[PDB]
Motif scaffolding. Structure first.
Motif, PDB file in Angstrom:
ATOM      1  N   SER A 281       0.820  -1.062  -0.038  1.00 14.82           N
ATOM      2  CA  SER A 281      -0.093  -0.204   0.053  1.00 14.82           C
ATOM      3  C   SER A 281       0.892   0.767   0.409  1.00 14.82           C
ATOM      4  O   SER A 281       0.196   2.523   0.721  1.00 14.82           O
ATOM      5  CB  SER A 281      -1.478   0.148   1.285  1.00 14.82           C
ATOM      6  OG  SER A 281      -2.002  -0.915   1.032  1.00 14.82           O
ATOM      7  N   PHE A 312       2.935  -4.623  -2.886  1.00  8.61           N
ATOM      8  CA  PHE A 312       1.290  -5.513  -3.151  1.00  8.61           C
ATOM      9  C   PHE A 312       0.479  -4.063  -3.280  1.00  8.61           C
ATOM     10  O   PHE A 312       0.102  -3.584  -1.826  1.00  8.61           O
ATOM     11  CB  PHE A 312       0.719  -6.151  -1.549  1.00  8.61           C
ATOM     12  CG  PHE A 312      -0.668  -6.956  -1.398  1.00  8.61           C
ATOM     13  CD1 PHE A 312      -0.634  -7.375  -2.276  1.00  8.61           C
ATOM     14  CD2 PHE A 312      -0.646  -6.495  -0.593  1.00  8.61           C
ATOM     15  CE1 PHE A 312      -1.530  -8.079  -2.220  1.00  8.61           C
ATOM     16  CE2 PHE A 312      -2.560  -7.511  -0.418  1.00  8.61           C
ATOM     17  CZ  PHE A 312      -2.827  -7.987  -1.545  1.00  8.61           C
ATOM     18  N   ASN A 313      -0.760  -4.027  -3.844  1.00  7.54           N
ATOM     19  CA  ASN A 313      -0.922  -2.925  -4.094  1.00  7.54           C
ATOM     20  C   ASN A 313      -0.710  -1.428  -3.304  1.00  7.54           C
ATOM     21  O   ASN A 313      -1.128  -0.909  -3.071  1.00  7.54           O
ATOM     22  CB  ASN A 313      -2.194  -2.917  -2.993  1.00  7.54           C
ATOM     23  CG  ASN A 313      -3.279  -4.093  -2.949  1.00  7.54           C
ATOM     24  OD1 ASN A 313      -3.062  -4.953  -3.722  1.00  7.54           O
ATOM     25  ND2 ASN A 313      -3.286  -5.005  -1.646  1.00  7.54           N
ATOM     26  N   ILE A 315       1.439   2.232  -5.377  1.00  5.27           N
ATOM     27  CA  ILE A 315       0.638   2.462  -7.065  1.00  5.27           C
ATOM     28  C   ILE A 315       1.673   3.919  -7.349  1.00  5.27           C
ATOM     29  O   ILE A 315       3.061   4.774  -6.033  1.00  5.27           O
ATOM     30  CB  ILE A 315      -0.336   3.032  -7.740  1.00  5.27           C
ATOM     31  CG1 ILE A 315      -0.803   4.819  -7.956  1.00  5.27           C
ATOM     32  CG2 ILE A 315      -0.648   3.951  -5.725  1.00  5.27           C
ATOM     33  CD1 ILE A 315      -2.151   5.087  -7.709  1.00  5.27           C
ATOM     34  N   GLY A 364      -2.512  -2.625  -7.462  1.00  8.05           N
ATOM     35  CA  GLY A 364      -1.616  -1.846  -7.860  1.00  8.05           C
ATOM     36  C   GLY A 364      -1.639  -0.851  -8.759  1.00  8.05           C
ATOM     37  O   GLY A 364      -2.873  -0.946  -9.313  1.00  8.05           O
ATOM     38  N   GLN A 365      -1.016   0.087  -9.096  1.00 11.96           N
ATOM     39  CA  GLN A 365      -1.417   0.905 -10.519  1.00 11.96           C
ATOM     40  C   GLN A 365       0.156   1.967 -10.783  1.00 11.96           C
ATOM     41  O   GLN A 365       1.125   1.623 -10.169  1.00 11.96           O
ATOM     42  CB  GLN A 365      -2.887   2.138  -9.923  1.00 11.96           C
ATOM     43  CG  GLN A 365      -2.408   2.957 -11.086  1.00 11.96           C
ATOM     44  CD  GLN A 365      -3.707   4.084 -11.310  1.00 11.96           C
ATOM     45  OE1 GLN A 365      -4.718   3.669  -9.688  1.00 11.96           O
ATOM     46  NE2 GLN A 365      -3.324   5.729 -11.384  1.00 11.96           N
ATOM     47  N   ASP A 392      -3.102  -2.236 -12.628  1.00 10.68           N
ATOM     48  CA  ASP A 392      -3.638  -1.107 -13.319  1.00 10.68           C
ATOM     49  C   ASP A 392      -2.910  -0.418 -14.606  1.00 10.68           C
ATOM     50  O   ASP A 392      -1.798   0.462 -13.642  1.00 10.68           O
ATOM     51  CB  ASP A 392      -4.997  -0.159 -12.505  1.00 10.68           C
ATOM     52  CG  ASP A 392      -5.323   0.837 -13.531  1.00 10.68           C
ATOM     53  OD1 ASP A 392      -4.911   1.362 -13.675  1.00 10.68           O
ATOM     54  OD2 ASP A 392      -6.428   0.772 -13.233  1.00 10.68           O
TER      55      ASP A 392
ATOM     56  N   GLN D  19      -8.417   2.030  -5.566  1.00 12.77           N
ATOM     57  CA  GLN D  19      -8.080   1.425  -4.078  1.00 12.77           C
ATOM     58  C   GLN D  19      -8.698   1.077  -3.202  1.00 12.77           C
ATOM     59  O   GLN D  19      -7.716   1.011  -2.101  1.00 12.77           O
ATOM     60  CB  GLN D  19      -6.632   2.287  -3.853  1.00 12.77           C
ATOM     61  CG  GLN D  19      -6.224   2.570  -5.679  1.00 12.77           C
ATOM     62  CD  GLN D  19      -4.867   4.071  -5.650  1.00 12.77           C
ATOM     63  OE1 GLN D  19      -4.011   3.291  -5.950  1.00 12.77           O
ATOM     64  NE2 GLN D  19      -5.698   5.230  -5.873  1.00 12.77           N
ATOM     65  N   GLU D  21      -9.202  -1.959  -0.127  1.00  9.86           N
ATOM     66  CA  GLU D  21      -8.486  -2.903   0.510  1.00  9.86           C
ATOM     67  C   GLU D  21      -9.322  -3.992   0.864  1.00  9.86           C
ATOM     68  O   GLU D  21      -9.487  -3.586   2.495  1.00  9.86           O
ATOM     69  CB  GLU D  21      -7.295  -3.265   0.781  1.00  9.86           C
ATOM     70  CG  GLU D  21      -6.242  -2.466   0.041  1.00  9.86           C
ATOM     71  CD  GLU D  21      -4.490  -2.487  -0.076  1.00  9.86           C
ATOM     72  OE1 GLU D  21      -4.141  -1.487  -0.092  1.00  9.86           O
ATOM     73  OE2 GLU D  21      -4.307  -3.353   0.788  1.00  9.86           O
ATOM     74  N   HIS D  53      -9.581  -4.778  -4.423  1.00 12.11           N
ATOM     75  CA  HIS D  53      -8.806  -5.707  -3.908  1.00 12.11           C
ATOM     76  C   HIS D  53      -9.286  -6.205  -3.389  1.00 12.11           C
ATOM     77  O   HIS D  53     -10.155  -5.905  -1.633  1.00 12.11           O
ATOM     78  CB  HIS D  53      -7.297  -4.729  -3.837  1.00 12.11           C
ATOM     79  CG  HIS D  53      -6.794  -4.284  -4.308  1.00 12.11           C
ATOM     80  ND1 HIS D  53      -5.994  -3.887  -5.067  1.00 12.11           N
ATOM     81  CD2 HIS D  53      -6.637  -3.023  -4.227  1.00 12.11           C
ATOM     82  CE1 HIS D  53      -5.950  -3.547  -6.098  1.00 12.11           C
ATOM     83  NE2 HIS D  53      -6.115  -1.984  -5.189  1.00 12.11           N
TER      84      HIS D  53
END
Lengths: 471, 254, 72, 71
Positions: A281, A312-313, A315, A364-365, A392, D19, D21, D53
């Protein structure tokens, strides 16, 4: 002249004695007819207990015998004039002997010292004399309202957290930093911020403002750093630099760590120093060249790598030179001028991966909002097994490595003259074994192609992403 | 000359103020100790209990009293560490089961801890840490105090009252014939450097006996612990269904 | 040979032909192994790095596998 | 965890969960749905939120049972 100098000291002694008499008179008047026990008994009796006013006062307070407990209201006095509440206080215990002063944990005087009582294996940064202030907007050359440099006190706080293995808690607001030294983590640590925690960096005092790291992490095995927002509003310096000067960051975890408007957000430049690292994140935004920059080894150098690496996730958005940034000039607090650009043909990309292995980019992005000059969204070179799960990707403004814009008009020309150039797609893959992408949604790609394969990429596999988006 | 005149007037005024302070302190016959309590180091004039055993032996005049415990064990000053396991306690008249942590019982009374933020540390139950040994084969830590029964009391309190259990860095030594059991949902948080060291010498079957058993721990979280044994004997963590399913347990940095 | 605190001795091994592996999975369903590593650094005697028996849907996503010393 | 409502998690307009979670969440025994995400209805302007997600989340036992229908 000695008499005229000592007269003022004598008058100071007079004033101090009179003020002392005034405090005793105030106590006796407030006490009134009632006995001491009755006064203590009154629901507000806790106010009749004496407290130290500030950390310096505690440094000057001489303990009669080792083992006394005292209260400290706040690290600095004068919070009541200002409209805020005390912070940094606590309980201290005395000891007779010698110890190295800290500014936080230990307050040392001649032949005695005081040690802070720490609860729940955790402490805050205010305990070390750090100050916060209101957060500036993200505009280009904008500094916060009031400029107190926190570097040396925050360094002492990190040293205590690493040495005693306490968790370091940080409050909302900006901590301002303007120093010639880089802030170093040198061991495992827990750092926990709040929504709103900001680290603002001013590069005016750095020896090499363009390349000097704000923050340096090494040896931080099993650490956890969370909820911090670093930005600099300068397009200069590295945000966070990972090294092996102390050791490997063997399973360090970052959560909700944001890095904005540096020259590189996250930087790695040597092998075997991020093995098994995790980014959850996280964000890298509006930096000048790249948001993520990993490069284990340069060309002609001995081969090396770090592996595995996990995202993980996360951007990455807005990284790369914009036209405003290309024309901008930074003004330092010493009234110097530093040109932001290196040359008029500068280009960047959102993320850059070199010399890694077993890399996973989950979710993620990667986007190019704000129209920076990019050769690609991601560039991957000399890696083994880079895998992308549902990321993305969107909004690239295409350029070659030379700086040449890629439009429709010249599209054919590009394909003939820049075939071996490492550019010209949303994702550029060069000399990578085991590349893989499933089927994310991609749109608004102003580039020759969506994926580019080169330099012996020989067992790739491509899932079905959104077709007909490139030129 | 002119400077000397004011410098001598300063002495005269200081002596007069000293006499005034002497006089007012003497006049305040029954209130002069408030002047003592209001000094910057006045908090030291308040008394406190030295250890948990002393707290067990402290007889409360009436229910609802508040007291301060400096540390769980006395003698930290002779050594080179800080007090630990202390806190604030409230008395009650009646009978309750002694815990070693939460409740200090005596004959006909007891004392209960004030818990802050729904969380407590293992030092509150009498646990001790020491220096972490190297990972070599048959190597034991330097000080051998067995924490199994005190850590089991802490686990029981954390499961029963739903407090979070906080653990400090250092090694906790375990050498007992009993296995450490987690029997319901729990939050456990360690620090980088928290170690649990298990000596299997007292086990009935050292080759196959479990060190830790976890069962019934739905929706729990356990984090940042390092277990090792340096023996190549035993099970490290055994997952069981003696109480129920561990339906959504999360282990992180274990 | 492990020496206990009561001065007892215990043979670490069960048989002179002992072998192991890094991870053993039996009788499970819907198992996901995301990232991570399975490796035999230090040259232990392994039949495999991971043994999977009698499972429905075991899926491995990008795990690092290396350095096995093979035994039957 | 969200249980025994009509909907557990509801989203009914675009651009509000970009975004987001979910880790280890549960929606259980709600009357219609456990998770209900609907950016736009029919005849409305196109819109979306992206990405989204879910990680080890469970929706179990949602929907109208015979007892619920008669309750």
């Amino acid at each position: 002249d000695n008499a005229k100098s000592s007269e003022n000291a004598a008058k100071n002694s007079e004033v101090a004695a009179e003020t002392t008499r005034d405090q005793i008179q105030q106590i006796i008047d407030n006490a009134g007819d009632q006995s001491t026990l009755v006064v203590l008994a009154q629901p507000d009796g806790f106010d009749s207990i004496g407290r130290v006013s500030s950390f310096a006062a505690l440094r000057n307070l001489k303990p009669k015998k080792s083992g006394q407990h005292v209260l400290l209201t706040s690290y600095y006095d004068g919070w009541a004039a200002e409209n805020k509440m005390p912070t940094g206080g606590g309980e201290f215990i005395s000891s007779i002997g010698t110890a190295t002063d800290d500014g936080g944990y230990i307050a040392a005087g001649p032949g005695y010292y005081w040690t802070r009582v720490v609860n729940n294996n955790s402490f805050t940064a205010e305990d070390f004399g750090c100050k916060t202030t209101a957060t500036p907007p993200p505009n280009f050359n904008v500094l916060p309202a009031e400029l107190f440099d926190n570097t040396a006190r925050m360094q002492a706080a990190f040293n205590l957290a690493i040495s005693k293995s306490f968790k370091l808690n940080l409050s909302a607001g900006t901590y301002y930093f303007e120093s010639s030294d880089t802030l170093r983590i040198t061991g495992p640590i827990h750092i926990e911020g709040r929504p709103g925690t900001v680290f603002y960096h001013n590069p005016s005092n750095k020896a090499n403002p363009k390349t000097d790291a704000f923050m340096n992490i090494s040896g931080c095995s099993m650490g956890r750093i969370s909820s911090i927002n670093c930005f600099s509003n300068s397009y200069l310096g590295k945000g966070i630099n990972f090294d092996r000067s102390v050791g490997d960051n063997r399973k360090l975890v970052l959560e909700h760590v944001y890095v904005d408007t540096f020259r590189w957000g996250f930087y790695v430049g040597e092998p075997e120093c991020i093995n098994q690292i995790e980014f959850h994140s996280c964000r890298a935004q509006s930096n000048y060249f790249q948001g993520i920059f990993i490069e284990s080894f340069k060309e002609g150098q001995e081969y090396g790598h770090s592996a595995p690496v996990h995202f993980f996730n996360t951007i990455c958005n807005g990284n790369g030179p914009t036209s405003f940034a290309l024309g901008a000039t930074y003004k330092t607090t010493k009234n110097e001028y530093i040109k932001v650009m290196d040359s008029v043909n500068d280009v960047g990309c959102q993320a850059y991966f070199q010399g890694l292995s077993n890399v996973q980019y989950i979710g993620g992005q990667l986007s190019g909002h704000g129209s920076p000059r990019n050769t690609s969204l991601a560039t991957i070179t000399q890696c083994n097994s880079f895998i992308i799960y549902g990321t993305d990707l969107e909004d690239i403004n295409g350029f070659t490595t030379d700086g040449t814009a890629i439009t429709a008009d010249n599209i054919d020309t590009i394909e003939s003259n820049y075939l071996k150039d490492i550019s010209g797609a949303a994702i550029v893959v060069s000399s990578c074994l085991g590349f893989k992408i499933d089927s994310p949604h991609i749109f608004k790609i102003k580039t020759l192609s969506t994926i580019k394969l080169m330099n012996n990429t020989y067992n790739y596999e491509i899932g079905g992403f959104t077709p007909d988006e490139a030129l």
